[PDB]
Amino acid sequence: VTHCLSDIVKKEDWSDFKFAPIRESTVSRAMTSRYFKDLDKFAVSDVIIVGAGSSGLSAAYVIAKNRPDLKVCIIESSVAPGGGSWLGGQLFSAMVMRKPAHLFLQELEIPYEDEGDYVVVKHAALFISTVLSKVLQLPNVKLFNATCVEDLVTRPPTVAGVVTNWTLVTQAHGTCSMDPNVIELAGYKNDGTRDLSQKHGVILSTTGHDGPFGAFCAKRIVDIDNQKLGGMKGLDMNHAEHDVVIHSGAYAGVDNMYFAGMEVAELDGLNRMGPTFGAMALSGVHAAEQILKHFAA
Amino acid sequence: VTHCLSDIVKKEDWSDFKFAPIRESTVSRAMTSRYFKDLDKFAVSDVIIVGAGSSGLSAAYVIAKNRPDLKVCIIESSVAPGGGSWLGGQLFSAMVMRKPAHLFLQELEIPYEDEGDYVVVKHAALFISTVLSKVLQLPNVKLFNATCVEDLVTRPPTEKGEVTVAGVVTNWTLVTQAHGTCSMDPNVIELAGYKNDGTRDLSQKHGVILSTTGHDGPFGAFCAKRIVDIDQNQKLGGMKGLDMNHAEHDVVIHSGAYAGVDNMYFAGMEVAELDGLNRMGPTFGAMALSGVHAAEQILKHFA
Amino acid sequence: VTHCLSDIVKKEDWSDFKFAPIRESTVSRAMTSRYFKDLDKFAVSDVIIVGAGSSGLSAAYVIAKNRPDLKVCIIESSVAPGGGSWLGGQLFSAMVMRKPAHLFLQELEIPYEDEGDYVVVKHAALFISTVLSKVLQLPNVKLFNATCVEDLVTRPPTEKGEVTVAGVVTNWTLVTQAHGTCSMDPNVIELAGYKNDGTRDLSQKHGVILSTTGHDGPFGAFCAKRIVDIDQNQKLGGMKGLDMNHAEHDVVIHSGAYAGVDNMYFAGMEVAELDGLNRMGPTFGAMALSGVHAAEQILKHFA
Amino acid sequence: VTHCLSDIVKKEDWSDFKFAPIRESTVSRAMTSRYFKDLDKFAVSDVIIVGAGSSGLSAAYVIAKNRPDLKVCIIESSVAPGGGSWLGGQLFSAMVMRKPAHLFLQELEIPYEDEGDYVVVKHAALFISTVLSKVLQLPNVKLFNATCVEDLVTRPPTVAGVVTNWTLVTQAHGTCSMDPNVIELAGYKNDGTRDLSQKHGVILSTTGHDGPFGAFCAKRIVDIDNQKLGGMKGLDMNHAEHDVVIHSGAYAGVDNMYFAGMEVAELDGLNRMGPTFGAMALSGVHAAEQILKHFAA
Amino acid sequence: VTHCLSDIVKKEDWSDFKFAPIRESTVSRAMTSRYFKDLDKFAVSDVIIVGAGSSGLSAAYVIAKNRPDLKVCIIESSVAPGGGSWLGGQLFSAMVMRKPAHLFLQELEIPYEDEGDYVVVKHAALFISTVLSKVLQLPNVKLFNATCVEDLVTRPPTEKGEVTVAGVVTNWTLVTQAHGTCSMDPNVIELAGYKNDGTRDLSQKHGVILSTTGHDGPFGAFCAKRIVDIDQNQKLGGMKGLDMNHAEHDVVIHSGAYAGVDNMYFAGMEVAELDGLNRMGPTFGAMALSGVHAAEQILKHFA
Amino acid sequence: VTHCLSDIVKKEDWSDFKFAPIRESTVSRAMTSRYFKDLDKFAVSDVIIVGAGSSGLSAAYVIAKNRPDLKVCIIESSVAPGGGSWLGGQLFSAMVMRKPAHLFLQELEIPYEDEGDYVVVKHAALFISTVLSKVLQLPNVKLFNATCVEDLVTRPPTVAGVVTNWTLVTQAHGTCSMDPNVIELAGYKNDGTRDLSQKHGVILSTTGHDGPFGAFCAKRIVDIDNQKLGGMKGLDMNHAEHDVVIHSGAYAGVDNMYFAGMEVAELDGLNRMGPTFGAMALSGVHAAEQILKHFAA
Ligand SMILES: C[C@H](/N=C/C(=O)O)C(=O)[C@H](O)COP(=O)(O)OP(=O)(O)OC[C@H]1O[C@@H](n2cnc3c(N)ncnc32)[C@H](O)[C@@H]1O
Ligand SMILES: C[C@H](/N=C/C(=O)O)C(=O)[C@H](O)COP(=O)(O)OP(=O)(O)OC[C@H]1O[C@@H](n2cnc3c(N)ncnc32)[C@H](O)[C@@H]1O
Ligand SMILES: C[C@H](/N=C/C(=O)O)C(=O)[C@H](O)COP(=O)(O)OP(=O)(O)OC[C@H]1O[C@@H](n2cnc3c(N)ncnc32)[C@H](O)[C@@H]1O
Ligand SMILES: C[C@H](/N=C/C(=O)O)C(=O)[C@H](O)COP(=O)(O)OP(=O)(O)OC[C@H]1O[C@@H](n2cnc3c(N)ncnc32)[C@H](O)[C@@H]1O
Ligand SMILES: C[C@H](/N=C/C(=O)O)C(=O)[C@H](O)COP(=O)(O)OP(=O)(O)OC[C@H]1O[C@@H](n2cnc3c(N)ncnc32)[C@H](O)[C@@H]1O
Ligand SMILES: C[C@H](/N=C/C(=O)O)C(=O)[C@H](O)COP(=O)(O)OP(=O)(O)OC[C@H]1O[C@@H](n2cnc3c(N)ncnc32)[C@H](O)[C@@H]1O
């Protein structure tokens, strides 16, 4: 039997095992210094992705892989990212993805079972953990998990950033009050006005349809903007997956604002697809394409 | 600007995009058929790992990588696996691991920042997502997430002790969390080693349970408490104060075979609860390496 | 009618008013940079005070005023500090303090009504807001509010006892209140006195914990219970009935160094829970003066 | 080592320490007598301030300091006053105030760190505790904390007072029922009609935007009055802080009614500012100016 | 068709009806002034009755009717007094009382149906509303409803026992129910018998507590549990099974002075919890008569 | 010392005390037989009063005292009747009643403190317990407490009864489902049609403004009927108490339907009065007058 310590630990009872000694504050400072550096670096971001589910992570991979220089800030309200992609339907495991979504799986080197017009990843968790791993390895991506977007930063008749807090704080806003923080989009001067020498940053909202804060940016934009929440319709896989992919990308009516995933179905009043995931990944690819074109222009 | 569909979607507006058509029942049947196959195949398992946190997943990797033929059944009560390893401390990100835990990171190809006597993974999420990915790709590993162990399957006492494990009693976590409120029976996952009359077959290797359910949360230290509750010759030590030097050392050394019960193994913070050890707070080297230690003992059992 | 802007706002409708312009990220960075500096500076503290109620804040004032060079780290689980001192009894306002506690009020310049053997501050809120203001102005005091102590950092037993304190284990209170529900690790604040290998440096003064977490609420008497839970040579006395004469006397006298644990101090109603003393109800002289007593002992330790 | 008892306690073990003996009822009566005197005195008030957060307390200081003769009744639903000013953003400590808000800090002798166009108070708690201390020391200010305004006292087509209860009672109104009390504004006779020989009292509502009873008086006035709740818009510090300060003061459509703080943003549909506090203090100053002018006329 | 306003309202549409005018503050001051007078007058009481249920209210009537000069202070945690006597069993109405409890009904002029060995009040609500009405009319009785006893005021041990009662610790019930969640101090109500230095005045009759808090609900058997919790020479018997013959007999006989504590009395179902007696279910004769028995002993104390 | 047992119990230790022996089932049957007799008798009622608070009980007394022959069915959702009349305001005790409400107190022989234009009952609980006692003593009044009205029984374009359940069942309707019972008004045949030889029964709804089921019949009538819920306005004692008394009685738009108490303020959009109780009692008297006239015609 062989493992990473086979050459270092020679006693069967592991009596010769040891860690190098440590002081508790060394650990605290190592963590906190790095988190402040993140908060400082990403206080102005090029791309803010709200929601690290299948659509948001798929988009994050394509964006960051193509433009490793861009600061991609991912805000995820739950402790565990991945949203609704840890399971298939009814607590079962298998993740069905219709072709050509398998081309995304090949790119990420995610194995699957080919069934002709669709493929199956043997566990939804395998897809999402793989995408997470690959996204997180990229140099200018930051995952702020346990952190919720509570509002939008705006400028008079565009988005200009997001308003953030610890999720557990947001969930206690009903119950002394606790202010949020802010993450700003690229493109402004120290007087708060537009700097046209800079490319404007963008928000991609991929907060799904479900859960405590589902379809968050859609509701807030509708709350402020002429626009109404379409409302997700009944389940119809052929029409739902097609429309979600096609409708994903730039939002008409607000500048520098993008959507993907099931949030698009809520906003545009499209069908839903239930336990199949091709459109989540590919809507992320589509949104990412449009976002990458914005930064190339 | 290139991506996986660049060769087949040529319209800027994606108007030429399409999925192959589908019928809803095809998707349903594709999912359900597979889940039953899993339930049928793993109804008798060689290794049952309770809790897919850092220590459980680290152990799973070492076991399954070394013995890809063993049925390794991972039961995880939460929807998302990974337990307490998606964050560092106080909702911050960085994962500190003391050397020699960095050798495990090297094996898994997880990048880190070397600070001398310890290293830092830039996000805890990077560690746990990577281990998950590599574990789940193995051919005889199954993750039953959203599924809780709520009791042990046992056989009567022997010379080895009062408690003799033979499997776990399972349910959907959401069902378990409603038991206090018409009642809903559990399922069972059995360990290898028994005949069709329920008695031991000594020609067969007995399966094992590795419990790695941590110390915290709704079901923390589950198997430790159940074993103590069944056998009053044993007691819960109770996790003591934070002391990184002593806690990480002791958790690693004390992980593995549990003295009073046969075919029963522990790793991670559940060991600290059971043996009354110190805790270490936001450092993770002992979680990975206690899993490695338990895995070694389990592999030797099957050798 | 005059106010701070009378010289720069001349329009009755304030149409000539303006702020200097600002960028949102400037504000964010101004806040976050400072909080990290605090976390870095106080990661090793000289005095850790658990609970910013009347007794904790009174102690903090005496300690920091006498020794402004000491890092005095105040951990308070609630958003608003002040604990039980924003009101008198039954939601009424007046704060009764028996003499000689009025001498403390004089030092803090808190006005009161003299009734002979006792005095009355016209609102409890006036006492606690004033002490808070004066404490927070001191240069090496830090208030980490919305932050809970959920465990102790320890070192192995010595001749001084079973429990040896070396810091506190911390988290955002809202996280602590969710532990029963993916798990979230704590942070640590360490006491002065240890080297980079985690062992004691006898050339350095050991830091101290003063626990003043009261008797009531979600985390009442936290350190008393944790110390009792770790060392079974000690037990929780349990707060007895209301008896103002005996309760206030005993709480003041019993406050200070805890007999069984080194570098550990108590004041306020937590002392009553630990030593099994009477309670006093809506009178506050013993809270302030027990803080003074504990502060004296702590200053002597550092002298 | 020296403290307030160094000349009175001479034993190291404090064995010579003693309190003067007391009877429990002496303490009870001292508290209750004073609270009834308060209830009696302030049953008719000149200024009722609803909400003791940054804006309400800032206004209370300016009003009471300039007119120490006026009965200023502060109603605060929480046990601890101070509202949302015990923290900065995301549970961090520092309180950023843009100039000229620093002139308010100088007046209250609150130390700060000067950063050019803005200043920083090292802990939000230092600002709010200092203002509280200074406000509470004034002779005709009363803080009724743990007490909630549940409704308004009115007279046919003005405000004439507030309807009060213990907050914990208000929070149980959903669950035998429990009547409120009343606090009346100055200006009426014993038959309940207007006494024009008296100056009419005023309400200043500063109940914020957040929490269990946020924007209370705004919602209730809109409920009764032609007026609609504007609804707080997205975060934009330049426009939010400017407008909140400017819009604070007398409400158009109801006589003797004033607003300040974030309640103004909800009512008038303004932007929000997130974790900066200059407009809270200065909107209170502005409202206080208008209120003081009403009582001077 | 006649009613109280027939002589002053002559219009069929009541258009000539009117109230005398009023100012809102007149009403407020009328209420608050009176409540403070109550708090001031009863701050020292002769008899403190904890719980305004059937047994407490029955005792109150007998005590106050016989000695109208005594300050009888009734503390009731609920908004509505009457405890468990607004209904019979299983939400049905009828109140069964075994003879000789019917003699109490006769004294209170409560009509009943005579069934031989027992009688029936047609609605439990009729019994409890009538006793309430007659009790509240007495000149030195005060009902502090919506007010909970959450502790006892005590003095140090004597020859009479470990626990020596000197009053009760009070708060608004809604505050007490929030203690587990900034902390809120209680008030105090003191028993007659002490001087201004808090010590006993042997020239004065000591006041008494009668606890009648039942067995059930949020604060059931409060004083029994507190007395047991303070003095470990005593234990909670625990209410046993239902046995009407033995339960009603024993509750009546065992009610009155508590053996281990001076100036302390019990009646009703709290006695069953304390002494470990049977329960009786939906019959109420023992509640009324145990109150009578306790009242007799209390009156003899003051005689 | 003398009590009801002084001639029966002669031992100081009460050792000679005894109850006559009993069998547990004797007690059960005595209770249950009587409750079924009530359910049977009142299954058709002449007057159904919904809510046994100050207004409903005041009305019940006047109705039943004048017409002891009428079956008066009082439905009360709480275990304890009395609604909001066990306390004055802010958990204080005193009950202020403006004249001429004192004439009602004299009739019920409730002592009070005369203060000129108003009187004070020393405890609200004294008023409500006295009225309860006197109402419950009447021969054809039944109090079904712990019982909630969940809906109305109707006949096509009138009320014809109420739909009832145990309150604890009603409160679990959100969580296997549990059907209600019915209480019918007098006036119908066994085929369910109107019997014009009989006087139609009436509903008086006095369910207040507050609590879990406040203003129940007002909301349900508005739900079905042309009519809108006025909504209770601000506190103004002079106008509120006058209007509540005047507006109490027959509802225009539904036949055989009456209101009194604060439910009238919700329905007709009137002011509220806070902690004064004259209008509650007198609105009950007014409603009772109209109801008694209906049964006299
Ligand atoms: C195909 C399947 N079902 C279809 C059907 O049933 O018809 C399905 O719903 C998809 O898996 C959804 O994927 P998508 O990426 O659109 O959203 P979701 O997985 O919920 O991810 C959203 C993520 O967004 C997070 N989130 C949600 N709201 C917020 C917020 N305000 N701030 C930060 N993060 C937020 C949330 O925690 C989650 O991780
Ligand atoms: C080092 C750090 N902090 C130390 C300190 O603060 O002192 C720390 O606690 C570690 O991250 C814990 O790692 P470990 O693998 O021991 O447990 P955890 O991450 O809780 O994983 C346990 C997993 O086990 C799951 N689980 C818990 N109970 C059950 C059950 N009965 N059935 C199935 N799954 C269960 C649970 O959801 C979770 O995913
Ligand atoms: C005299 C009066 N009544 C006596 C009686 O009724 O008999 C009375 O109880 C005093 O006001 C209590 O003063 P003290 O300073 O002992 O405690 P408290 O005011 O509860 O302050 C404790 C503080 O400590 C905080 N706290 C409590 N637990 C924790 C924790 N684990 N970590 C951090 N902070 C904690 C808590 O939020 C609070 O602010
Ligand atoms: C600048 C910052 N954030 C801006 C942003 O996020 O965009 C911010 O929100 C300010 O700190 C708010 O200050 P403001 O004084 O407007 O309100 P707040 O601090 O909530 O104080 C309101 C006070 O009013 C109290 N309160 C609230 N409602 C009531 C009521 N009905 N009766 C009595 N008191 C009440 C409440 O407890 C609290 O103390
Ligand atoms: C005979 C019947 N059933 C017997 C059986 O089922 O076997 C039965 O239980 C009797 O009705 C009980 O009468 P009793 O007077 O003992 O108590 P109860 O009616 O609960 O009245 C207690 C009162 O006491 C109150 N209370 C209870 N605890 C407290 C407290 N700590 N402070 C103030 N008041 C308190 C409570 O609200 C209540 O009103
Ligand atoms: C004057 C004072 N305050 C004025 C102000 O604040 O402005 C005040 O509100 C009065 O005391 C109210 O008297 P009223 O008789 O109108 O109602 P209330 O005492 O709530 O009685 C209603 C009764 O009706 C009951 N109830 C309420 N809903 C139902 C239902 N659906 N079925 C049966 N019973 C019901 C409820 O339990 C209660 O006992």
UniProtKB/Swiss-Prot annotation, chains A, D, F:
One term of GO molecular function: ferrous iron binding
Primary site of residence: cytoplasm
Pfam families recorded: Thi4 (PF01946)
2,3-didehydroalanine (Cys) modifications at: 177
Keyword NAD among UniProt keywords: yes
Induction description: Repressed by thiamine.
Family per similarity comment: Belongs to the THI4 family.
Protein name (record): Thiamine thiazole synthase
